[PDB]
Amino acid sequence: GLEETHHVFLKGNGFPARFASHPQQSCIFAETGFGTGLNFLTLWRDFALFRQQSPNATLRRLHYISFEKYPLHVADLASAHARWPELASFAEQLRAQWPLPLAGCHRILLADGAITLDLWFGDVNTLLPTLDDSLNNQVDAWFLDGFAPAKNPDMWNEQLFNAMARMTRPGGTFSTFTAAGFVRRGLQQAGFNVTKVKGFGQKREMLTGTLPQQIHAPTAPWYHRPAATRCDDIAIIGGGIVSALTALALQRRGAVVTLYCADAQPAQGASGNRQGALYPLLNGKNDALETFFTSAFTFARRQYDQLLEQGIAFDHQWCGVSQLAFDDKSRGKIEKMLHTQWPVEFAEAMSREQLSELAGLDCAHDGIHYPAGGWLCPSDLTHALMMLAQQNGMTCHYQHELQRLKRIDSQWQLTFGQAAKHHATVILATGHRLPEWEQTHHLPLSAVRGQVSHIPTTPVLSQLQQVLCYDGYLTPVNPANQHHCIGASYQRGDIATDFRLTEQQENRERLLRCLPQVSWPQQVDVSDNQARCGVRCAIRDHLPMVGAVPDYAATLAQYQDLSRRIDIAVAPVWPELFMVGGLGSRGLCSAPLVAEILAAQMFGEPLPLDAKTLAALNPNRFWIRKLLKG
Ligand SMILES: Cc1cc2nc3c(=O)[nH]c(=O)nc-3n(C[C@H](O)[C@H](O)[C@H](O)COP(=O)(O)OP(=O)(O)OC[C@H]3O[C@@H](n4cnc5c(N)ncnc54)[C@H](O)[C@@H]3O)c2cc1C
Ligand SMILES: C[S@@+](CC[C@H](N)C(=O)[O-])C[C@H]1O[C@@H](n2cnc3c(N)ncnc32)[C@H](O)[C@@H]1O
Ligand SMILES: [Cl-]
């Protein structure tokens, strides 16, 4: 059982000995058929011993990538783990984070961020062609497990073996329990030098191999995501939600990061509301957007829960979010969402009466329920994260408004309309003020003002248990303050944040206009004129922008022949300059994954989504779309 898994997969790949001699900060494992996580857990255990033994070794981080067609339920997993008492503490940590069986990639951060696990739910043969370039020449060791080739040969094909080899780092290796000739030959022609060796207790034979030379893969240069060359010296310009997260995700990898915030405090931009909704944006199309939002939402709740379990404090309730079909238009949208077959734990159609049963108040309409969503307080959250970011080594310079940005001799010159500063690597996280630079002003980002009202609760109002979405939204009472949030105005190209009376009334009218069949909405009282204004940064396709800051003039020039050639050059970018923004009204949900993607990209690591989704999040994607045909 345990000793076997060890013999085949860890020993068959050089471990535990390779740990000590590994030349890199992290090591990438890739596994076919996760199952109950035996291989992963056995590997975790060994990497933990190693880290205790040699706290000073090059290898600090571990990245495990795995495919599973039939993801088990967490109970199943707990039942099986009983076979192995000594993996219990690792097993427990993995079960505390098992995700719902939703299709696609689910990144789990384990062992205090020393371990990144990517769970890809789906049939491996179908997923492979869809994957990103950041997987090419990346894998240190394969764990080629699965059903026995004779009992089921459906996965052991040339397409699989080739992709494996394509994703393997030169010098990297694989091992598998099986011995079957066509596998031998299948892996050899894929590009490995294969050795046949005896299995555990000479019961059955098995195979191991090494990739002697890098394979020159199918590649997609136009949407290339390059790494930063130096992560020892980084500045973020921002101070909003996406900065805290971005900072945090870089300090997991040991980057040194510095914060420059225009305001006296963080979260004085758009991340500063009292209560914001958190739920996924579905559309039933299975496009880039849905796929992204499916991972981002679940990831977001995971991270916010981990944070929570570690003492970080912010007002919030995962009370579930109820989205209402109040409209011919909205009802049609909800109807299209509900075409994909979601787990009820993710999203569920429900009737007026069910939603009203849950809500505590008559909801006037049927709709869709998101049981894991809720509200949180973005202000408290951003302050909390900036602080932890600080405590873990991020120097912060508030009242520091960047005024000029210049690259002169390997360094970014920063000027502050106070002491000027220079940095090797810079990230822009400025929200709506993102396209204000020579360097960023060709990006199709827009500013959209919004005002959220603050309203006292009432005995009947206090009853509401869900966040409600219509043409606008109403949160439950915050127990700590006895007030709700109801919003929001949406003013394109308006960037002022002065309180407006017109917009205050509109927030109530939206609620009354959309739920005319019931009477309790009348209890919403905006007459105290308390509200908050802020500016959103919107993108016409609804996905954020995260990556290398692209070079407009250099792109149109470099890619004139593009449409024709479907080996080209990788995309033109401003050196060591990256960004993350364009979160519109869904940043609570999208920030954590965009944050992680940036850190991941800047460390040249493999990324947690497929080629089209990643492509669809790239800063240069809008330019690349015109020139992608003419
Ligand atoms: C009315 C309204 C309602 C919303 N409702 C929701 C909701 O229900 N759910 C949800 O998820 N999200 C909601 N949002 C927020 C949405 O997610 C935002 O897009 C998100 O908060 C973006 O945050 P950010 O960190 O990218 O930028 P911001 O939070 O706006 O931060 C930008 C930062 O950059 C700094 N800065 C800017 N320029 C400079 C300069 N040049 N030099 C130094 N520092 C600079 C500012 O000081 C600020 O700290 C709402 C927003 C608004 C305005
Ligand atoms: C031996 S079991 C899992 C053992 C696993 N190595 C462990 O550590 O527990 C093999 C697994 O392969 C998965 N599998 C089989 N075919 C697959 C495919 N085409 N794509 C993804 N997973 C597959 C099965 O669902 C099954 O969970
Ligand atoms: Cl908000």
Residue numbers in the entry: 34 to 450, 453 to 601, 611 to 674
Give the original sentences from the paper that presented this experimental model.
Methylaminomethyl modification of uridine or 2-thiouridine (mnm5U34 or mnm5s2U34) at the wobble position of tRNAs specific for glutamate, lysine and arginine are observed in Escherichia coli and allow for specific recognition of codons ending in A or G. In the biosynthetic pathway responsible for this post-transcriptional modification, the bifunctional enzyme MnmC catalyzes the conversion of its hypermodified substrate carboxymethylaminomethyl uridine (cmnm5U34) to mnm5U34. MnmC (formally known as YfcK or TrmC) is a bifunctional enzyme responsible for the final two steps of biosynthetic pathway of mnm5s2U in tRNAGlu and tRNALys, and mnm5U in tRNAArg. The C-terminal domain (MnmC1) catalyzes the flavin adenine dinucleotide (FAD)-dependent oxidation of the Cα-N bond in cmnm5U34. The resulting imine intermediate is (presumably) non-enzymatically hydrolyzed to 5-aminomethyl uridine (nm5U34), followed by S-adenosyl L-methionine (SAM)-dependent methylation to yield mnm5U in the N-terminal domain active site (MnmC2).
